[PDB]
Amino acid sequence: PQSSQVTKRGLTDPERAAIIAAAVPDHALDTQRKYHYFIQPRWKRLSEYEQLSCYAQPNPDWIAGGLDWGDWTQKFHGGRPSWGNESTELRTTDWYRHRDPARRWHHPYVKDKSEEARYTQRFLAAYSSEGSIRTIDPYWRDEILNKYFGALLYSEYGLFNAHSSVGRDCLSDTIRQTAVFAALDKVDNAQMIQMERLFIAKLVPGFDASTDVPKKIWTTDPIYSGARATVQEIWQGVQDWNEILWAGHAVYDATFGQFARREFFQRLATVYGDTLTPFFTAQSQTYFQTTRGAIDDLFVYCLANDSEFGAHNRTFLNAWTEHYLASSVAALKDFVGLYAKVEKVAGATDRAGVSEALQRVFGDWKIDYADKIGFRVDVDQKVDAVLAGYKN
Amino acid sequence: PQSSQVTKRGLTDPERAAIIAAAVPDHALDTQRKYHYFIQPRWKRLSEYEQLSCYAQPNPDWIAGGLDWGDWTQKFHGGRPSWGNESTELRTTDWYRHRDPARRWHHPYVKDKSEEARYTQRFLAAYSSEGSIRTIDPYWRDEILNKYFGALLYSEYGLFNAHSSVGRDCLSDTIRQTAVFAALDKVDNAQMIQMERLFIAKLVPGFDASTDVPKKIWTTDPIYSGARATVQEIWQGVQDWNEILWAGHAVYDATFGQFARREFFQRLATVYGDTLTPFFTAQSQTYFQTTRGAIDDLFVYCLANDSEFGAHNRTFLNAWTEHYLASSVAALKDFVGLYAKVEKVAGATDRAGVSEALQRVFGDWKIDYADKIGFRVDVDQKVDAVLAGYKN
Amino acid sequence: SAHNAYNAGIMQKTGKAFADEFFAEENQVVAESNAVVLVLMKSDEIDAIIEDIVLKGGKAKNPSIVVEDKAGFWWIKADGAIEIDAAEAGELLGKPFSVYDLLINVSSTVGRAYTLGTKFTITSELMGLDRALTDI
Amino acid sequence: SAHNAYNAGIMQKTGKAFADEFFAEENQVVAESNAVVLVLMKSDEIDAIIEDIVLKGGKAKNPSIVVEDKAGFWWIKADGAIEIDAAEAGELLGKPFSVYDLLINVSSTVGRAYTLGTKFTITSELMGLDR
Amino acid sequence: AKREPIHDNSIRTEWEAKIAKLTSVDQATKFIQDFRLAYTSPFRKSYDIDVDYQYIERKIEEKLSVLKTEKLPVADLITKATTGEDAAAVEATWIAKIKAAKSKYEAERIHIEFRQLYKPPVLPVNVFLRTDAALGTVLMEIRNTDYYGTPLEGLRKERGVKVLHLQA
Amino acid sequence: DALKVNRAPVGVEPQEVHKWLQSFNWDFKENRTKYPTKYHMANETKEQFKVIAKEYARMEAAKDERQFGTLLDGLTRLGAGNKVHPRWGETMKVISNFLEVGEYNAIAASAMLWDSATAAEQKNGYLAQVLDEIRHTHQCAFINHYYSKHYHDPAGHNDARRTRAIGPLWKGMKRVFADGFISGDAVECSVNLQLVGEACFTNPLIVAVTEWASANGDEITPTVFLSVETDELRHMANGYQTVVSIANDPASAKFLNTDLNNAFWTQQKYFTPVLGYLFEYGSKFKVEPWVKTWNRWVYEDWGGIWIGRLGKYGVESPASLRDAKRDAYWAHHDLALAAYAMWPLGFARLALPDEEDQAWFEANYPGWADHYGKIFNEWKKLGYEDPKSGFIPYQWLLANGHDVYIDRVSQVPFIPSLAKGTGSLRVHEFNGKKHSLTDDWGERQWLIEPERYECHNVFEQYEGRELSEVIAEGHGVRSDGKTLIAQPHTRGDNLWTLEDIKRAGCVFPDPLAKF
Amino acid sequence: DALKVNRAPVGVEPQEVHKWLQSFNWDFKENRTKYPTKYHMANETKEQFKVIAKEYARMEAAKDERQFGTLLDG
Ligand SMILES: [Fe+3]
Ligand SMILES: [Fe+3]
């Protein structure tokens, strides 16, 4: 036995199920069965993503778009509101307008990352069984990948932590989900770089997967000097949560981050016989494009074209872009000094190859972000500014 | 008011649930709750894989290991039994002994492949968004990858269909699961090669993803002459189901197939700037290693070391290996003519590079299969035989 | 409509009246039927599809549809054909829903079944044997 | 054991007898307890773990363990500590079962909880304060 | 007496008409500072628009913010208050002010008035948030020193309330 | 070399990556929290549940697949969504949507803990917690989404994110597990969110309630809520690590006891009456008396296993505990008087205690029959349930001198002339504005920190307006635009409409005008 | 070229691969069934449910997760 009643279940206990059936009306008491039917749908029909997410944040009418009323029940000492308009320079007629185009609420987000988690471990067990590491260039493996790809994890980690104040401060539910999912993808990137290094260490005697050398390089090597300065500023130097998301994803990670991950480590892996690193950069680049879809919606569809504050918001976005683009250009000018340490490969690591890689990064960025907020940019000028750091 | 009774559920209807509760005994009528508790566990305790799979095949005692008795209820015209000992030359004290080391019953198998299915489509949507196809070598893309990797799908497809008679003829349940899962992985490989070509066609104007040119190459190009001859024999030339599985996976696919997939297309993708193909070969190589674990268990643990028939079975395995290794050496000798069409890259496509790739394939094969059945092989002799087809 | 009921015709009779018709000379060979039967296993998505698609636009286009509650599944019988557009279902459900997802709870078919685009169809037609009635 | 019952002590009382003890002066401050409480939501894997681990080797090692049926979950209370080894659970269930998988149906803890290796532990110990 | 509807009423409408007449950064800065002194915080001058002032304040903020982006150089948006003051000078001045406070009653009024005068869009958001946090750190620490040390009867006197009713 | 390599199959397990996380941080002058805090002590602690992003998603997705399988396949085929006693199905409109906002605020509070953490391992742990609170928000939403689709009354399951704003019980929900977490000291969240909220109150709120759901026919809520709380082990453990750091530093430890008492009072002030009311009055079948549920989980187990054990290290039993125990016994009965009297402002359909309920209340709370029972029975005689009666009890309270006040701090309603729980009315004027406070602990919070507590109450917003106009403006109606969502009975007939409310002529007063 | 490309997001749907499956066979004399049969007629027909290996697995795993959730949990 047991000291407490074994509660009878109303679903299956005959006596309680009969009492319940006598109490339940024989007809429905309303016909509206669409959960939060009053949300304005972004697409041709209301999505489950919108139903589960929208208006979960309890904003009052004095935060644009809120459906509640009155002051908060408890504020910070001094009077800072639980959420408030003072959190950001940008303005809108409705902070709830943002929609992630991938429609990620928590369940599809972890469902997809679980697939990647399990398949990654199956891939590694087979790759080690295959012996495919035998054909990687050793200098690339030991002197470039281990050390400087390792150091890049600190950029991802800093971008992860830039989101901590965003998660507290931002003003609607769909924005908070977008920000938090972006943060986990950045710390995942950092962890996946370390996972690749730990994996190589099991296959290559003498290969050291300690972060000691990567951290020394991130913190003191001139190659990462500009990048680290930018990440420190975006993470800890500002608190406007729109400024963090824009500077972090739409300027710095879209120029410096894309060049380092895609044009340097991923592209050059496929010039130096590295059959392992492309499996890992496949994930970070997939995450980048998913994050970009949501960042683009927030800043372009919603804020840069808000019917009342679009031009107002473009004034701030233009000023931020001028500042952080200069920071990112300086970061890339520092970073292309790494090409002086790699084996020359025509069209890839010579001046023409690096120039074309920079034309892709700045040219794509002009299309994806600059043109959509009215920021004028001379791509050739930015390419030449970075190439001043390239050792011929 | 539908024409038929709305049946009352016994779990929830008060009257029927009360009748059921009165009928159910107040104690369990046995304590043995382990489904098919009498299966001999391969590992420390019985696995769910074994419980759900083992003895599903209803063999009688005159097929080694069977627990039933008597003749089949209906045989082929002439007398061929539903299953019988005449299906293979190999013998064993128990056809049920095989265990897949991955313990795949149907559910974990499709769970894992579903992960790869969904992640592949997210990867492709991001890769096209990234523009990363821009740095692939065009000659590799158009003259080598499109044509000769395309042609390789026919090898995978032929190996897929070799399993059709295996699926009907083989003598136990765990062997049947191993064979069918191996077959789906082969047709998946063929489909994924076509999927990659169809995807590149969306990115590269003028790139033709029709199978016309791959099929012409497979059926008439001297480079695939020996391979196609071998696949035709393994698929349609024999019906001993152990001979098919051994020749197919343990000889031909482990030498020719591994060289073409891993040493040629995967490895050289990472010499010619191909950031796309490694995503697809990652899957075929994972599948190869999973299949090999199961094939290894069947032929090494169970058949080459069967307590009564081990030496008997090695006599046949040795004879098969002699024959199909010669077929595969001839296939490779033809195939390395493809190097005459690729841009020379020192250590990869020169004679020294190809020789080291053949040393990996034949050396790994000697360890993974030959040594375990007592098959003598001189690796240097096989490497030299293939290099006679290499144009200096 | 009535002739498509699960208990249509002889199924209304019991006892000796049933036996007399069951064993009648004319009922010892099959009779051609123009019907199709579709079984859907009950689930959140299927039950929404039954209520808002099959019993609304489906029955508006084909008034011979009968739907019967069989505890764990829905039994549907109709003259000629039944169709379900997965695109219409996905609009109703608010989540990704291809024709492959529709099939997750399509449990059985008596008739010629196929998918084409986003639409699932079961039909009395004998494709490959019946000849087209228009060149269009 | 009896002191670890869900309805131990004052919970046996009803009506005025309950109120008299509930409002007694000595019961207006908390009292240190050496117990831990572990809640496991019912499921095929959890129910096997309850019957063949907690109520066999667990209770033999810690005879103060009490398990009560709370409809949707198991309520477990014990002196000192409760431990569950995922490796032992995995052997019982016949399927891959890491400590991470064990946590899928570990619904709540009153006490200090952690995993170490394949083992989950909830303890009265105040780690980082106790020696 | 009788409140009008919550979200649409004559008080909000009348204030929106006043706000629409603002045409310069200087005018709207004096307007919003005067408004926040008159109608916000426990030390406000008037509760006459209590259920509407937060929405009205939002609308003033929006007008000032658009006037700033229309009229000011970019560098002023980052480094100056709309009073014309250097934003970093404002930060240093008010942190020093609250660290010089002698009691929690002095400290609380400094923090409250800092917000009444410099809440965005008057001060740039980044400078304001870090100043508000530094001020709040000091206020919390002085308030949480001997938090239970003064009896309620004495706290009511220190606060200066008029006690209208105490249930027996 | 190019020929020889170890080909043993290896991967990289989560703990192998986790051991390098602490080295991911680096030193720079600006590397410190952005939020105000009193707590500045060393806090370099270690995660008790090693997790990395990939493993986090693997674990949570596995929990989800089992839960959504049960809901969308099994329970739907059983018709379980309409096998719930009406009282309980109405209760879940409130429990799930109110819990939703607690989960939602816990995302933001967890982000403050992430921001104020100094160790990379703890920053990693708090991100996992941030993600879990997003999971729990969507899980609570999913319960009301499922009820909207399958239960006989979807109204109010389908729109609480706006219809909650009409009523007075929602105001206190925005403090109890919401503003009270996120509007204050960031490191202190380890005390209020975690040592109190998660370690004490989530057990009765999320776990114990599943037994009441099951008793009343609801197997949806156990399926979801029991999965929600699986994440809570990691949250309690995160907070404990920081409490240890606070305890070990004399300068930070001197704040801990005051923060713990204020957090405990703040949360219990609302949680104790409101959840006790929802359990006992919003059920047909009762599992046990609420006051025993509270005794088991709050006073004995959390009180002894967390607080009593920490007493060895200087943590004091909350000084407000005696006041809280009085609330555990009577405050939910006091709250029921206000909830039933003001039923038109809610979004749920209520049921007066029936004859066997009344016997149970009196057996377990002697004195209930002669106080609360007689009031409910008189309301029934006057026509409480009958839309043609013209009777709403809030007006009856005022006609008999039983005024309703709102605590300026907690927002909990208080009826001093009928209450048996803890409370006494204090009314102060300050700078031209009157304020009502209802207990010694909240009165101190307001006297010391008036600029933290300026929440408008429903009488201030609605003063002089007629009840039916407030309900219509707030969308408190069904899809016909006229029938109230809220009802004073749970039957399918004789539902009240806006015109039925209007005939009562109920107009909101200023309760403090008399002072 | 190396700078210009369509960056519209695209994948490859199962029916896009399935269209090419018929072409995967090739002609050779021994390419015929191993089993005895009376039936030797032409049989070059088309699948009514286009499926490829990846999509096969996705569909069945989706069925399985719902079924095993119901059994093992609810
Ligand atoms: Fe939570
Ligand atoms: Fe939590």
Side-chain angles (χ1 to χ4, degrees), chain B residues 48, chain D residues 41-49 93 95 105, chain F residues 66, chain G residues 71-73:
Chain B
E48 197 169 61
Chain D
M41 63 182 290
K42 287 183 184 180
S43 72
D44 179 81
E45 299 92 333
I46 283 306
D47 292 2
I49 284 160
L93 298 163
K95 63 182 189 183
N105 292 138
Chain F
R66 295 160 68 96
Chain G
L71 291 183
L72 295 184
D73 184 62

PDB file of all heavy atoms in Angstrom, chain B residues 48, chain D residues 41-49 93 95 105, chain F residues 66, chain G residues 71-73:
ATOM      1  N   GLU B  48      16.637  -4.941 -27.637  1.00  0.00           N
ATOM      2  CA  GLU B  48      15.337  -4.839 -28.277  1.00  0.00           C
ATOM      3  C   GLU B  48      15.432  -5.223 -29.748  1.00  0.00           C
ATOM      4  O   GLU B  48      14.524  -5.861 -30.292  1.00  0.00           O
ATOM      5  CB  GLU B  48      14.805  -3.409 -28.094  1.00  0.00           C
ATOM      6  CG  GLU B  48      13.335  -3.247 -28.332  1.00  0.00           C
ATOM      7  CD  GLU B  48      12.845  -1.861 -27.876  1.00  0.00           C
ATOM      8  OE1 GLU B  48      13.349  -0.877 -28.448  1.00  0.00           O
ATOM      9  OE2 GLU B  48      12.019  -1.780 -26.926  1.00  0.00           O
TER      10      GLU B  48
ATOM     11  N   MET D  41       8.082  11.010 -14.121  1.00  0.00           N
ATOM     12  CA  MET D  41       6.815  10.898 -14.832  1.00  0.00           C
ATOM     13  C   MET D  41       6.664   9.493 -15.396  1.00  0.00           C
ATOM     14  O   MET D  41       7.638   8.869 -15.833  1.00  0.00           O
ATOM     15  CB  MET D  41       6.683  11.942 -15.946  1.00  0.00           C
ATOM     16  CG  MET D  41       7.661  11.870 -17.050  1.00  0.00           C
ATOM     17  SD  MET D  41       7.386  13.238 -18.274  1.00  0.00           S
ATOM     18  CE  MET D  41       5.852  12.838 -19.085  1.00  0.00           C
ATOM     19  N   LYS D  42       5.438   8.976 -15.348  1.00  0.00           N
ATOM     20  CA  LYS D  42       5.220   7.595 -15.751  1.00  0.00           C
ATOM     21  C   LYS D  42       5.467   7.421 -17.244  1.00  0.00           C
ATOM     22  O   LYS D  42       5.065   8.249 -18.064  1.00  0.00           O
ATOM     23  CB  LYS D  42       3.803   7.155 -15.403  1.00  0.00           C
ATOM     24  CG  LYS D  42       3.614   6.940 -13.902  1.00  0.00           C
ATOM     25  CD  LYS D  42       2.223   6.434 -13.626  1.00  0.00           C
ATOM     26  CE  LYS D  42       1.959   6.288 -12.132  1.00  0.00           C
ATOM     27  NZ  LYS D  42       0.567   5.781 -11.927  1.00  0.00           N
ATOM     28  N   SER D  43       6.101   6.307 -17.597  1.00  0.00           N
ATOM     29  CA  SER D  43       6.375   5.963 -18.986  1.00  0.00           C
ATOM     30  C   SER D  43       6.860   4.517 -18.972  1.00  0.00           C
ATOM     31  O   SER D  43       7.130   3.959 -17.911  1.00  0.00           O
ATOM     32  CB  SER D  43       7.435   6.867 -19.606  1.00  0.00           C
ATOM     33  OG  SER D  43       8.726   6.551 -19.075  1.00  0.00           O
ATOM     34  N   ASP D  44       6.961   3.921 -20.156  1.00  0.00           N
ATOM     35  CA  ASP D  44       7.400   2.524 -20.218  1.00  0.00           C
ATOM     36  C   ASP D  44       8.770   2.354 -19.571  1.00  0.00           C
ATOM     37  O   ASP D  44       8.984   1.426 -18.773  1.00  0.00           O
ATOM     38  CB  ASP D  44       7.419   2.059 -21.671  1.00  0.00           C
ATOM     39  CG  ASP D  44       7.896   0.621 -21.814  1.00  0.00           C
ATOM     40  OD1 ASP D  44       7.076  -0.304 -21.595  1.00  0.00           O
ATOM     41  OD2 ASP D  44       9.088   0.431 -22.127  1.00  0.00           O
ATOM     42  N   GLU D  45       9.704   3.251 -19.888  1.00  0.00           N
ATOM     43  CA  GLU D  45      11.065   3.132 -19.359  1.00  0.00           C
ATOM     44  C   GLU D  45      11.109   3.419 -17.858  1.00  0.00           C
ATOM     45  O   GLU D  45      11.745   2.682 -17.085  1.00  0.00           O
ATOM     46  CB  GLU D  45      11.989   4.082 -20.127  1.00  0.00           C
ATOM     47  CG  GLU D  45      12.057   3.765 -21.627  1.00  0.00           C
ATOM     48  CD  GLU D  45      11.029   4.540 -22.497  1.00  0.00           C
ATOM     49  OE1 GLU D  45       9.936   4.927 -21.997  1.00  0.00           O
ATOM     50  OE2 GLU D  45      11.332   4.742 -23.700  1.00  0.00           O
ATOM     51  N   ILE D  46      10.446   4.500 -17.426  1.00  0.00           N
ATOM     52  CA  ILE D  46      10.411   4.838 -16.004  1.00  0.00           C
ATOM     53  C   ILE D  46       9.756   3.731 -15.190  1.00  0.00           C
ATOM     54  O   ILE D  46      10.200   3.420 -14.076  1.00  0.00           O
ATOM     55  CB  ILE D  46       9.681   6.181 -15.777  1.00  0.00           C
ATOM     56  CG1 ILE D  46      10.584   7.351 -16.147  1.00  0.00           C
ATOM     57  CG2 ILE D  46       9.219   6.301 -14.314  1.00  0.00           C
ATOM     58  CD1 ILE D  46      11.938   7.333 -15.451  1.00  0.00           C
ATOM     59  N   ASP D  47       8.660   3.155 -15.686  1.00  0.00           N
ATOM     60  CA  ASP D  47       7.975   2.174 -14.849  1.00  0.00           C
ATOM     61  C   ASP D  47       8.847   0.930 -14.646  1.00  0.00           C
ATOM     62  O   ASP D  47       8.846   0.340 -13.563  1.00  0.00           O
ATOM     63  CB  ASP D  47       6.615   1.804 -15.447  1.00  0.00           C
ATOM     64  CG  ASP D  47       5.590   2.979 -15.395  1.00  0.00           C
ATOM     65  OD1 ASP D  47       5.930   4.101 -14.935  1.00  0.00           O
ATOM     66  OD2 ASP D  47       4.430   2.758 -15.817  1.00  0.00           O
ATOM     67  N   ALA D  48       9.615   0.533 -15.669  1.00  0.00           N
ATOM     68  CA  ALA D  48      10.561  -0.565 -15.497  1.00  0.00           C
ATOM     69  C   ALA D  48      11.678  -0.204 -14.513  1.00  0.00           C
ATOM     70  O   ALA D  48      12.121  -1.052 -13.723  1.00  0.00           O
ATOM     71  CB  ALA D  48      11.145  -0.966 -16.860  1.00  0.00           C
ATOM     72  N   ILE D  49      12.163   1.040 -14.564  1.00  0.00           N
ATOM     73  CA  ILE D  49      13.196   1.506 -13.637  1.00  0.00           C
ATOM     74  C   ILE D  49      12.681   1.505 -12.198  1.00  0.00           C
ATOM     75  O   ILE D  49      13.385   1.075 -11.272  1.00  0.00           O
ATOM     76  CB  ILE D  49      13.686   2.902 -14.070  1.00  0.00           C
ATOM     77  CG1 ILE D  49      14.608   2.785 -15.284  1.00  0.00           C
ATOM     78  CG2 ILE D  49      14.351   3.646 -12.918  1.00  0.00           C
ATOM     79  CD1 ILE D  49      14.767   4.070 -16.101  1.00  0.00           C
ATOM     80  N   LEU D  93      16.478  -2.238 -20.249  1.00  0.00           N
ATOM     81  CA  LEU D  93      15.559  -1.859 -21.314  1.00  0.00           C
ATOM     82  C   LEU D  93      15.948  -2.431 -22.672  1.00  0.00           C
ATOM     83  O   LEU D  93      15.105  -2.450 -23.581  1.00  0.00           O
ATOM     84  CB  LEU D  93      15.471  -0.327 -21.423  1.00  0.00           C
ATOM     85  CG  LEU D  93      14.928   0.348 -20.149  1.00  0.00           C
ATOM     86  CD1 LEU D  93      15.237   1.850 -20.147  1.00  0.00           C
ATOM     87  CD2 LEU D  93      13.443   0.082 -20.021  1.00  0.00           C
ATOM     88  N   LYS D  95      18.029  -1.118 -24.931  1.00  0.00           N
ATOM     89  CA  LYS D  95      18.150  -0.127 -25.990  1.00  0.00           C
ATOM     90  C   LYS D  95      19.087   0.971 -25.518  1.00  0.00           C
ATOM     91  O   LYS D  95      19.338   1.098 -24.314  1.00  0.00           O
ATOM     92  CB  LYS D  95      16.781   0.442 -26.386  1.00  0.00           C
ATOM     93  CG  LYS D  95      16.046   1.198 -25.305  1.00  0.00           C
ATOM     94  CD  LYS D  95      14.707   1.640 -25.876  1.00  0.00           C
ATOM     95  CE  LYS D  95      13.955   2.599 -24.965  1.00  0.00           C
ATOM     96  NZ  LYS D  95      12.611   2.936 -25.550  1.00  0.00           N
ATOM     97  N   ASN D 105      12.460  11.675 -18.591  1.00  0.00           N
ATOM     98  CA  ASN D 105      11.281  11.533 -17.742  1.00  0.00           C
ATOM     99  C   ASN D 105      11.583  11.756 -16.259  1.00  0.00           C
ATOM    100  O   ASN D 105      10.807  11.309 -15.409  1.00  0.00           O
ATOM    101  CB  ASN D 105      10.626  10.161 -17.929  1.00  0.00           C
ATOM    102  CG  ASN D 105       9.987   9.978 -19.310  1.00  0.00           C
ATOM    103  OD1 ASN D 105      10.122   8.910 -19.916  1.00  0.00           O
ATOM    104  ND2 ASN D 105       9.283  11.009 -19.807  1.00  0.00           N
TER     105      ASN D 105
ATOM    106  N   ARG F  66       7.698  12.296 -27.994  1.00  0.00           N
ATOM    107  CA  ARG F  66       6.816  11.465 -27.176  1.00  0.00           C
ATOM    108  C   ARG F  66       5.553  12.234 -26.797  1.00  0.00           C
ATOM    109  O   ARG F  66       4.438  11.720 -26.924  1.00  0.00           O
ATOM    110  CB  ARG F  66       7.566  10.986 -25.933  1.00  0.00           C
ATOM    111  CG  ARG F  66       8.747  10.046 -26.282  1.00  0.00           C
ATOM    112  CD  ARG F  66       9.796   9.943 -25.149  1.00  0.00           C
ATOM    113  NE  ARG F  66       9.319   9.252 -23.949  1.00  0.00           N
ATOM    114  CZ  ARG F  66       9.515   7.961 -23.670  1.00  0.00           C
ATOM    115  NH1 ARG F  66      10.110   7.142 -24.524  1.00  0.00           N
ATOM    116  NH2 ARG F  66       9.105   7.480 -22.501  1.00  0.00           N
TER     117      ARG F  66
ATOM    118  N   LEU G  71       2.357   4.868 -27.472  1.00  0.00           N
ATOM    119  CA  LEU G  71       2.508   3.634 -26.691  1.00  0.00           C
ATOM    120  C   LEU G  71       3.339   3.857 -25.436  1.00  0.00           C
ATOM    121  O   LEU G  71       2.950   3.450 -24.333  1.00  0.00           O
ATOM    122  CB  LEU G  71       3.184   2.535 -27.539  1.00  0.00           C
ATOM    123  CG  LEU G  71       2.391   1.939 -28.692  1.00  0.00           C
ATOM    124  CD1 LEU G  71       3.253   0.825 -29.319  1.00  0.00           C
ATOM    125  CD2 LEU G  71       1.049   1.367 -28.212  1.00  0.00           C
ATOM    126  N   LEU G  72       4.520   4.451 -25.596  1.00  0.00           N
ATOM    127  CA  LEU G  72       5.504   4.466 -24.526  1.00  0.00           C
ATOM    128  C   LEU G  72       5.243   5.569 -23.523  1.00  0.00           C
ATOM    129  O   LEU G  72       5.669   5.465 -22.362  1.00  0.00           O
ATOM    130  CB  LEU G  72       6.909   4.627 -25.101  1.00  0.00           C
ATOM    131  CG  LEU G  72       7.400   3.466 -25.983  1.00  0.00           C
ATOM    132  CD1 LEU G  72       8.820   3.729 -26.396  1.00  0.00           C
ATOM    133  CD2 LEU G  72       7.307   2.111 -25.268  1.00  0.00           C
ATOM    134  N   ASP G  73       4.535   6.603 -23.945  1.00  0.00           N
ATOM    135  CA  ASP G  73       4.253   7.724 -23.070  1.00  0.00           C
ATOM    136  C   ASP G  73       2.806   7.650 -22.612  1.00  0.00           C
ATOM    137  O   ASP G  73       2.534   7.126 -21.528  1.00  0.00           O
ATOM    138  CB  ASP G  73       4.548   9.041 -23.792  1.00  0.00           C
ATOM    139  CG  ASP G  73       4.353  10.228 -22.894  1.00  0.00           C
ATOM    140  OD1 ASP G  73       5.062  10.324 -21.876  1.00  0.00           O
ATOM    141  OD2 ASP G  73       3.466  11.038 -23.203  1.00  0.00           O
TER     142      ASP G  73
END
